[PDB]
Amino acid sequence: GARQLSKLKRFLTTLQQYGNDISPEIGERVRTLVLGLVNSTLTIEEFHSKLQEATNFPLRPFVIPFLKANLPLLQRELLHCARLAKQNPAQYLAQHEQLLLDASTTS
């Protein structure tokens, strides 16, 4: 299931350079929506529409079915995790994708 994860990381690097390519807080704004989405704190339809609100860009429509396909992908692996903890996969992916996101690791 780690494959999707490595591809979604490519994906965040894309949004952020894309908003940044324009100029203002707009890469931060688009990043705020991607965080809202992946943290399970925004609705799918809302994530998409706000993102375009900010970017005023006509955009590739693959993004909705993208994350929609990221459910059937990672869910068997992540749901097994969820099962044990006795929590919904939504909040599990929430707490997991954010700790693998953080930069507190000195290494």
Taken in order of first residue, the domains within the chain and their CATH numbers are 1-107 (1.20.120.1110)
Confirm if 18 and 34 have CB atoms less than 8 A apart.
Answer: no
Helix (H) / strand (E) containing 62: none
Give one word for 12, left, alpha or beta, with left for phi > 0 and alpha for psi -120 to 50: alpha
Residue-wise burial string across 20-29, b where 16 or more C-beta atoms lie within 10 A, e elsewhere: eeeeeebbeb
